[PDB]
Amino acid sequence: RAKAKSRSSRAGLQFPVGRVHRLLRKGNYAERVGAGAPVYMAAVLEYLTAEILE
DNA sequence: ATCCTGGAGAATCCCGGTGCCGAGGCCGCTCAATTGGTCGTAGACAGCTCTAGCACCGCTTAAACGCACGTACGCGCTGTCCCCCGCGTTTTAACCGCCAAGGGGATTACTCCCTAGTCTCCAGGCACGTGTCAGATATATACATCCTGTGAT
Structure with missing residues (x-):
């Protein structure tokens, strides 16, 4: 049984x-x-989030 | 009428302290992510057909190109006028904090029943084929609108 691991x-x-x-x-x-x-999508949302926050 | 300091008078920025309530970190816990295995079918792939998009040619001719004339329009300048702005005083009700009541949103537990998924069968609808009528084309005639002269007012 492999340990559960967050995909993030x-x-x-x-x-x-x-x-x-x-x-x-x-x-x-x-x-x-x-x-x-x-x-793919998670990376995109994160990218855009960073741009605004920056 | 317009430019150049120099002062007066507000208005706006910066400085330092009060204090508060909204962010930020911690703990419990619970249910949504992760794992692991099974099934079946959507998508990848190769192959083949043959539609239709590209390229080329020459001819006809209606559009595009360039020029010249001249005048209706855009633009700037002037002066009137009037209607907004800025200030001060009076009047209103918005906002704040506190209180109470209860209406309706949110959650729970339970049960059907209203749908999805399955199989079978047939007629409603699409691809093709054919015939002829509506609209396009072109001819020719007659009516309507536009723009200078021309007399009347």
């Missing part, structure tokens, strides 16, 4: 990834969401 850490991100994946698959955006979509 894995991706080197501060924004949550599992949650983004979760949001993407529902809200009825699509029947299915690919593994790399949540990750």
